[PDB]
Structures are given as structure tokens and as C-alpha cells.
């Protein structure tokens, strides 16, 4: 029964080890979006403002 | 009114449409052509309808006289205003100018009597100081024959004609204010008609006809009189020999260009001001900086000649050769004298459509700016504010909120309290992207009143904007105007004024929805530019918000913005005139938000652009009418003619400090990118940037200037790029980069030398002065001031004194014989004109002792003389010893009839000698009008400052201070200046009444008829008092000849003040004269005569080496209370009884006790002066020694004036020098309740621990 | 030993509860990824060429009123 | 056999203890991410109030200042 | 006892994983707060850039147009174009500290030269004489 319980512990530990790979996939997706914010911040740094010639009213 | 005279000098623009309107009402044919024919339609419409008034009927008869005279001349041709200038600069008629010729010939006779003795007195004065060996021979012939040189000039015969026409026209204006028809006066070559509004001149030989208004006559008189005085001054003085010929050729060349070119000649005249700077830039050491700005000037001159039809290659080359002859000279000091001849040609005629289309072009331009450069400048702006608040508050950071993404450098600097450099601000500009300052600048508005009293014209309402144009020039009847015209009239008559109410009028947003807001333009009075310049007028509340906004910027944040190796600098001069048109809301918005966060006012500093973007602007001149059939509101008006419909920009002025403090961060950004150091100086529309780089000391002078020029050029390119990124468009061709010179207020600075315009003040030395009544004394004081200013800028001293005497004699003769005053009775004119010696003795006697000469011989050498009475008596003794004036005149000075003046008049003017009828009458009229309008003002800011019984309190204070056993008049002046009396006098003095408030007080009746009759006749009283003085025969036996001037001045002050003083002594007003005390000796070689002969060892030592080239290289009220306590404790003694009176006087300004009050209360000389070593060791009275050093510098300037270098010997110069307690007899009347007005009274003692300030 | 083994299985069931939370994290990152992609689509629209590339975008004042005047007509 | 199974359980448990370094790594990436968003908000804050009429109805973005400069007329 | 001692080591590692449970839950709150922050940022960004004019247009010469080597400026003078440049070179010769015969000879040489590049060679030769 103790041997049966130990195999159940091993099976749950392998399930948590499969969860680790999904957590690492979260890290890659967070890092990819961080670059996307960074390149958008560069383009808002390079904005030129246009002023019209005559006021409307 | 009988107290207002027509204006002597021109303070108004020249408008073509006025001349066209007069000549079309008079139906006279004319040769003018208008860019807008709108007036030329409207008049016709009125003449189609039959509209007429008194001015139309009066002008028909004048035109009929002109047509009846022009029937006699068949081939007559009218010439317009510019094209006739060469004729009207040279016009003479012998028959019409007889009386002024006889008057000036009599002046030549009197000056020919006294000129030799004037020369002898000046020669003795020169020989006392040791310069007698170096006196030039030509100076004698120039002094004796000065009137002959004045009368031999080519502008004398023009000046007599134009002075006659001006004076006769002024007689017509005042007399008409019988129906006599003006008739022509047939001269030798000129036929003349003078009316109130029109002067018709017909030349009999050429059959040329000229029509002129009053403004043109005033302009021609000023121009010809300035040319006459300037040519006389250059002919007499020997240093201006080549400049005389060059400016004569300039006059001939431009006067030749006037008939063919016309009004575009003034563009060349305005181009004469860049050209001196370009020709001075040609002599630079550096490589390509020589002909940079001359190329732009020559290209624009070629464009001016090409656009007007003179497209010939021969003409331009001859103009270049002529300009090369005029502007090339060897002396640097004579290069900048061409700036003085800038106004010698006249002023252009103007029209509103051209200025309107120029502002329309500039304010309706699209732009694209860059966000990054704007945020970098914003980061530098924040860094400057942070460093200022750290410097004034002990290194503490101001209240601000850094964002989450702030850099670690900025956060650690905020935590550790460390300042920020510019590099950290520019590199980490994203750390200031979302900062929000706290409120740390107070709004002090109830403590200042100095600004609203300044007069500023107010525009009309928006519902009634056509009221400025008369019914005569309009096709429709305009609405009658109800708005007030001036700022001070609304401000004083305001029943409820709150300084925070107009700020709420901005913040609440009522200015965008105000039905009565209006801005208008008006043409400038004196601009050489043909397009001209404009000044704006707006309504009451918006102008008040503008004044409060500029005060808030000036008193707060803007004070933050004020500032084996050597250092070299090079200069950039730029113009800032058109920057205001370039500012927009997007560029100024972030800076205005930061100022809103600092000052705690929501949307306040953004007011100008938001108001201007929704409003229609127009240029207003009465003679230029809108092209409208009926009355139409401004928003329906088309975008043509004088109207600018929806502007994007800033008005000239009105936000200048904000634009300046926004502009400086971009200069620092260009400095950081170029790696240079900047010192920045801002003049009026001129900016000088000094670029500094560190250089080795071992390098020669040639390479260091090349290095400074290289880094300055690189900085200039980077600065042009960064100013273009925000949209200013610096336009590099107009700016100038130099390695030596920069321009500022005094003159040109050239490598430690000052190049000054000495001949401008001589051109400003004219007859009469800008006063509402013609006074002789103010005119003579103006002559003395202009001659003294010319002496300080480098003119010769003795020649200026002789010209001053000649101009005083001529001014007295014009004031007696050729005047429009009807109060000049025959009881004073005939005795003065028949007796020559009486008039000469009146002209030569100094004014502190009763004469009409306002220039002293000590004043020619030093700026400050101590006692005017003692200096005047010393000058009179010099004139007696030189036989210029008789001895008995001195006795007359000591037997003069005393005048009537109280203790208050003595305390206001401590050096006065109680003379009869000396005070300027315009000042008296302004003081009475200002006092009346400030007492009778319902303004709640003036609740208790001005009372009806103020004058009795002021006289009681003066009689309390100066009726003690010893009279000290200088200390009482200092006490009254810092008391409530001087506070009221300072508030009344800053209000300029001008003509308008004097007329308004005349309609109110504050000026009584006795006041008008008495103030109308004071010139006759001055001449009567002078005649009674000089004809009296009373002698005093205590007057010894060649006695001390100090004892004579004490006896004079005791005699004139004997009613008030009653024999008590007077202390603290006597000082020895500068010229009498000091005797000079020059040691070229072999010892001193004075030291060996007299044994005197009290002297100052001056040394000039040989072989040097001179030509080339708390609250204010608390401080007032402290000053009152200090002067009263010092002058009247200190004990227990005297400190109580000092506490009672000082309590009225600040809220302090007795113990707290005890605890808290405790030039042209530089040409020699760079080489001069002054040692004061052999001296043994600080004022006498300081004026001695100034006299020594003046003597060494006079010695080397005409010589280029010191020659072969060292120059050595020697200038030898030859109360327990006062108890109070009166008792203090004081005031029953202390005034609690915030301008004057300080409610809190504030910092009692700090005894400084 | 058996009592300790039931305790170990008891804590392992609590540790297996985190899988729904990690999927909840994944949906939040997916929601952000849509939000950034719309902003990148909005950012690329106003980009133009500048003569002189740089590709600096220009933002108008109200809705793009200034862009009709400054820009070259296509 | 049971003791050998315990060594396998400990060996699989060691890598789960190493997951704490990865979880701390996600914390640093989120901290870097919120600074990067804060730069965008700082750029949005400056652009919005420099250009007039762009605030998307916030009741006058310039008027976000504090009001106590001894004024208080209300 | 050894097997029981190992089981206590198993329990202690599982409690350490339970301490990690709260920290991972804290990450989910911060990601949730960032998505609200970027969504409000998206709403403000969508309001601003509605112009939508990756190239569609060009600016109609609003650039600074930086200065060429041939064109003159405040930095320096370079001879170019027609009539004004000859006058500037003539003014530099007339304002110089040279001898009068040398100045007249340079006037003759300047009147000889016609080409624009040869005017530039004269100006470099002229400045060499002034520096020498």
C-alpha cells in the first residue's frame, strides 16, 4: 500500500513538472510583449506635431 | 484753454490718406496714388450726397485760393512727399525770413562781443590743470568765430525758412481755436500759403507745387535743424575731418536718390544701419568672417534697385563704389558715428494695408514641429527652475512629483538633495515627461500699484468698432462711441476693483465669451522701415490681466533665469523682432502648464493664444476707412484690407518674459550638443550670445580667436537646426557672427573698447522742448544736458561750452522776439532787446544763482558736482576774473530778492536758494492734476493713502523736522522720501497725466481760473525777475573779491532763507568746487614746479607708459522704517527722547515695537584708462578724492585726444589738492488712526532675527 | 508512514489546484496581446515618409485639419 | 523498493524547488513592463495637453493644478 | 524510521511549494492591473491618432535646407552667383592692410577672372595674402 501511495506521489510530481514547461512558455510570451511595448515607445518618441494656419472660429 | 500750445516736435506717424483727404475736400488736384482707393470712393459718395460741415467749407475757400494762384503758373506740376525732399531740404526765400535773420544776426553780434573772453576763461581753466602747453591754435579761431561757422553752413538758409513756417502755422492753430481767407505771400522765389491744415508752396522758377500738412513741417524743421547743428559740430571739431566729407557725400547721394526712387529710398536708408556693422566685420582676424554679412546687404540693395525698375548694371556698381567711399575708415572710433546719422533723412509715409498684409502673411502660416527637441528644452527649463529653488532655499528640492519611469539619477538626486547639471537633463529627458510641480510662488497683488498708473491706450468695444472712423470718411453713419480711451481713467474711476477678480475672469473662462473684447493696431510714430511697426490696443480687463501676468512672471520664476589655461569668447548677434509672430500654442503650452503648476493658477498663462484664435483683428487709422456699405460685425468681415481674421501667433510685447524664458533652454541645448559655454545678453530686440572655450595660455593671440570662431560657427549651425525644429526659422543670413564686436545700449564693444555715437545728442540739441507750454528754462536745461552727454561720449569740452552759450543766447532771443505767446508784454520785450549787456549777463549767469545758463565748467570734466550754489559762485568768480562779467553782478547775486517757499519745498529740494519763479510749470500742472485725481478716486485700493488733508500733514512733518535750532535740510529729505509723504509723492509721480488728464481736470474744474492765469504768465515773470536782478544796485560791504566760495554760498543761503531760518545755522550743504581745489602738473621730464615751489605733498599720482597704441588693441516698508530710524538716530542725536519720535515715524510704515526697532536697525576715458596707473599713496573728503581721480582721467583723455599713440616718453601727472544733539521744538501732529493699506503699511514684522535689509 | 503518505497526497492535491490559475494568467496575456496589436495597427497608419528613411509619424490638431495644408497632394 | 521510490520522489521534488527562481524572474519582467507602460503614459500626458482640444473630455487638462496661492475668491 | 524521515523531507518541500503559491497569485494581480492600464492607454491613444493620412505623403519643403559649401552664410563667405560676390571681394581688397600697388594688381587679376570656380580660387589666394 505504501508502494502504491509512492507511485501516486510520483505521478502527481510528474504533473507538476509538466506545469513548469507551461510557466516557461509564459515567460517567453511576457518577454515578447515587452519588446512590443518598447518599440511602440520609440515611435511615440518620434512624433512630429502639425499646426494649422488659420483658427476655425 | 490758453495753456495748451500746438506741438513743437513730431510724435506722430505720417499717413498718405490724411494728405489725400485734405486735398480731396479742398478739390485740389494731386499726384498721389493709393494702394486702396476706398477713401477715394467714400469722399466722392459724400460729395454726391451733399454732406458738409465747418471743416469742408473752410477747405473749399483755401482750394479756391490755390486754383486762383495756379492760374498764373501754366506749367505747374505737383510733386508727392518723398520725391520733393531734395527740393525741400534746400529751399530759401530772402523776403519771407527777415525777422529770424535779424534775430540771429543780433545773436552773432552778442557772441562776437563775448567770444574772446569766453576763450580766455577756458584757456585759464586749461592752463590751471597743466594742459596749457598742448592747446591747439585752431581752437581759438573756432571759439571766436563760432557764429560765422554756424552761419556759413549750407543748412542755415533752409532752417530759417522751415522755422518760420512752423512758427506761423502754430500761430494759426492756436488763434483759430471775421472768416479771414489765407492769402499767398509773394517772395523772391517762393509763394507761400499757410493754413491750419495745409501749406501750399509754389516755386516761381521751376513751377513746382508742394502741399504739406503740419506733421511734414515739424519733420522738416527737426531734420534741417539737426543737420545744421551736426554739420556745425563737425566743422568746429578737428577730430571729425574725414567723417564730415563722408557724411556730406552720404547726404548728397541719398538726396539725389529721393526724386527718382521716392518712398523705396527709405529701405536703403534703413539698410545703412546694417552696413556699418558689416564694414566693421570686414576687418576681422578670422578667415571667412570678413565679407559674410556684407554679401547679404549688397544682395538686398541690388534687390531694392531691381524691383523698382533700375535694372542696370552701371547704377549698382556706382552705388557700391559710393558706399565703399562712405563706410571705409581707418579709425575704429569713427566707424560707429554713422549710427548717429540714421534719422537725418526723414520718415516714410505709411498706409495700414501693407502692415496688415505683412502680419497676415506671418500669422497665417502652417508649421510642423518636433516633439523631441521641445521635450529636451522642457527638461532644461525644469532643471533651471530646480537649480534656482535649490540656490535660494538652501539646496532643497521644490515640491514636485516625479513619474514612475524616472531615472535613478534624478530620484537619487531628489532623495540626496543634489543639484542637476544640463547633461543629466538632456540625456534623461523622459524623466521630466510627466512631472507636476507644486505651488511655491506667492501671488503678491495688493502690495503693488506702480503698474496700473502707466498710461496705455484702450481699444473700443466690439459692438462699436467703427467709432474710430469719422462720419466724413465713411459711407455709413458710425455708432457713437461710449467706451473710455485710457487705462488710468477706467482704473481710478472703478468703484469695485479686485486684483483677484480679473484672475477669476481668466480662470472661469469669461474672456472667451466676452461680447466686448477687441484688439486693434496702430502705426508707429518713428520707424525708418516702409512697412513700419504696429502697437496694439485692447480693452480694460484683458490689459489688466496682461499686466498682472507679466508682473507674476517678473517677480517670480523669471528671477531664477537671471545669471596654464585661459578663456576666449566670440559673439553672435541676432534679431528677436519677428519671434512673437512665430510662437504658437503647441510650443508654449507645456511651459505654460509648468508655470500654472508653480503659480497655482489653472489655464492662466495660456490666455493670449486662446483669445487670439477666435477673434478678428484690425488695423485702425482714422483716415483709412473699411470697405463696407453698412455696419457689419467683425466676424462677417472678409480677410482683406486692414483685417486679420483668425491669427495664430503672439502680439508684439504682451507675453515677452514667457517667450524669453522659453527661448533660453534651446540655447543651452545647442550649447550641450556643440560642447561650448554660453553667456547670453538680451537687449531690446537684439540678442548677443558669447561662446567660450578654454584655450592654452602659451598660444598666441591669433590662433585663439580662430579656435573661438570655429566653435562659435559650429554652435551657430546646431542652434539654427534646433530653432528650426521648433519652428522659429532663424534665417542665418540676417544674423551676424563676430570675433571682436557686439552691440549693446551704450554703443559697440570692440575688444575692450567702446565705440560711441557722440553726434546724436548734438542732433537732439534743438530749440524748445516737449512741453505743453513754451518755457525758456526747460529748453536751456535740455541744451545743457545734450552738450554734457556729447562731452561724455567724446566731444570736445570747450567747443561744446561755446556752442551751449551761443544756443542759450539764440534761445533767449527766440523766446523774446519770435514766439506765439501773447502774454509777452512790451514792458519786458523792448527793455531786454534794446539793452544788449542785460541779455548777455542773463545768458551767461548760472541758473542756481538766478541766471539761464545750466552748464557749469566743473560739469564738463566730472559727472557729479556737489553743491550747485558753490560751483555757480566759483564759475561767476572765474567770469569776473576773466572780465566776461562785471564785479557788481556778484553783489547783485548776494542782494537778490528772496522768494516765498515753505519748509516742504526746502525738504523736497535741499539745495534750493529760494529763487523767484524757477520751477518748471508742466511739473506743477502734472502734480496738481495727479493729486486731484488720486484724492478724488473711488478705487478701494486707495482707501486711506490720499486724504483731503494730506498737504497740511506733509507741511507739519517738514516743519517738525526743519524748525530745530540747527537746520539740516539733507537729512529731512531722506526722512520724507521714506515716509508716507514720499510714498504719496512716488505714487503721484508714476502717474503720467500728459495732455489728456490735464484737459480732463480742466473740464472737472480742479484747475481754477486763478491757476490757469497764473501758470500762463510765468515766462514773463522769469524775464522780469532776471531783469530786476541784473538792473538792481544794492551792495554788501562784507563781499571781498576772490574770497572763499563756501563762505559766499553760506551767506547767500542765509540771506535767501532768512524768513524761515531766522539766523539759525545750516549744516551739510557745502563742499569745495572741483576746479578750484585741484591744480595739475605734467612731468614730461625733470621734476615738478609745484612740489619744489610750494612744498605741497598732497597729490594723486597718474602714470601712462610710452609706446602704446591708443587707437587699436524683507519688505520694502520695513527697509524704509529701518532707514527712517537710522537717519533720525544719526542726524538729530540718539537718546531716550529721540528714539520715541523715531519709533513714531517708523511705526507708520511697518508694524514694529521700540525694542525690535532698536535691535534690527544697526565713457570716452577708456582710451587712456586701460593704460593708466593711478596711485593714491601720496594723498593725505572721499568725494573730493573720487572727483579728483575722475578729473585726472579727463585731463589724460584731453591730453591724448588727437594723438594716436603715446610718444617716446612716460607721462606723469600730479593733481595737488589745495552737533551734540538737535532737540525738537515742535510737537508731532501725526494721524489719529494708522493707515492699513497694503501698499505702504506692513502688517507683519516678518524676519526680526535678520537685521540685514 | 501511511498517515504521512496521506498527508503528502493531501498537499499534492492543493498544489495541483494552480493549473487553473496559470491558464487564467495565459488569458490575461492573450488579452494584452490583442490590445498591443490594435495599437501597433493604429500607430502604423499615420506614418509617412519625410524627404531629405526616418518614417516619423505626424499627429494633427483636432482630427487632422493641418494635414490637408502641409502634405503633398497624392 | 519503497526507499528507492523515496529517492525518486526527492529527485523530482528538486526541480520544483528550482521553480522559485523562474517565478522571481517573472516578477522582474512585470516590474520592467510597468515602467515601459509608464513611459507611454508620460508621452501621452505631454502630447494631450500641448495640443489643444485633444483631451477626450477630461474637463480642461491644464486645470489639474492645485489652487491655494492665497487666492480663494469663491 | 529512515523512510519516515524521508517523508518529513517530502512534506517540507511541499510546504515550500505552498509558499510559492501565494507569489504566483500575486503575479496574476499585477498582470491584471497592467491590462487595465494598457486598455485605458489604448482608449487615449485611439482618441489622438485619428488622422490616418508605410508611406503616403511628403512634406512640401518645410525642412531647414542646410547650407551648401558654395552658398554664403553667417558662418563664412564663399563667392557665388553674379554681381554681389565681386563687390564683396573688391571690398575685402579695399579694406585690407596691403600695399596700394599690390591692391591694384589684385584688382586687375579680379577683373580678369570670369569663372565661378576661379573666383573661389582667387578668394583662397586673397585670404592667404592677408594672413601672410
Curated annotation (Swiss-Prot), chain D:
Residues 38-54 are annotated as: Interaction with the L polymerase. It comes from the Viruses. Residues 1-53 are annotated as: Multimerization. Phosphorylation on serines by host CK2 is necessary for the formation of viral factories. The N-terminus consists of a long intrinsically disordered tail. The central part contains the coiled-coil multimerization domain (MD). Forms a four-stranded coiled coil structure. The C-terminus constitutes the alpha-helical domain (XD) that binds to the nucleocapsid (N-RNA complex). Belongs to the morbillivirus P protein family. Homotetramer. Interacts (via multimerization domain and XD domain) with polymerase L; this interaction forms the polymerase L-P complex. Interacts (via N-terminus) with N0 (via Ncore); this interaction allows P to chaperon N0 to avoid N polymerization and non-specific RNA binding before encapsidation. Interacts (via C-terminus) with N-RNA template (via Ntail); this interaction maintains the P/L complex anchored to the nucleocapsid template during the sequential transcription. Interacts (via C-terminus) with protein C this interaction allows C to associate with the ribonucleocapsid. Essential cofactor of the RNA polymerase L that plays a central role in the transcription and replication by forming the polymerase complex with RNA polymerase L and recruiting L to the genomic N-RNA template for RNA synthesis. Also plays a central role in the encapsidation of nascent RNA chains by forming the encapsidation complex with the nucleocapsid protein N (N-P complex). Acts as a chaperone for newly synthesized free N protein, so-called N0, allowing encapsidation of nascent RNA chains during replication. This is Phosphoprotein.
Curated annotation (Swiss-Prot), chain E:
It comes from the Viruses. Residues 84-132 are annotated as: Interaction with the nucleocapsid (N-RNA). Coiled coil: none annotated. Residues 39-53 are annotated as: Interaction with the L polymerase. Residues 82-132 are annotated as: X domain (XD). Residues 1-53 are annotated as: Multimerization. Homotetramer. Interacts (via multimerization domain and XD domain) with polymerase L; this interaction forms the polymerase L-P complex. Interacts (via N-terminus) with N0 (via Ncore); this interaction allows P to chaperon N0 to avoid N polymerization and non-specific RNA binding before encapsidation. Interacts (via C-terminus) with N-RNA template (via Ntail); this interaction maintains the P/L complex anchored to the nucleocapsid template during the sequential transcription. Interacts (via C-terminus) with protein C this interaction allows C to associate with the ribonucleocapsid. Belongs to the morbillivirus P protein family. Essential cofactor of the RNA polymerase L that plays a central role in the transcription and replication by forming the polymerase complex with RNA polymerase L and recruiting L to the genomic N-RNA template for RNA synthesis. Also plays a central role in the encapsidation of nascent RNA chains by forming the encapsidation complex with the nucleocapsid protein N (N-P complex). Acts as a chaperone for newly synthesized free N protein, so-called N0, allowing encapsidation of nascent RNA chains during replication. The N-terminus consists of a long intrinsically disordered tail. The central part contains the coiled-coil multimerization domain (MD). Forms a four-stranded coiled coil structure. The C-terminus constitutes the alpha-helical domain (XD) that binds to the nucleocapsid (N-RNA complex). This is Phosphoprotein. It comes from Measles virus (strain Edmonston B) (MeV). The chain holds residues 323 to 507 of 507 of the full protein.
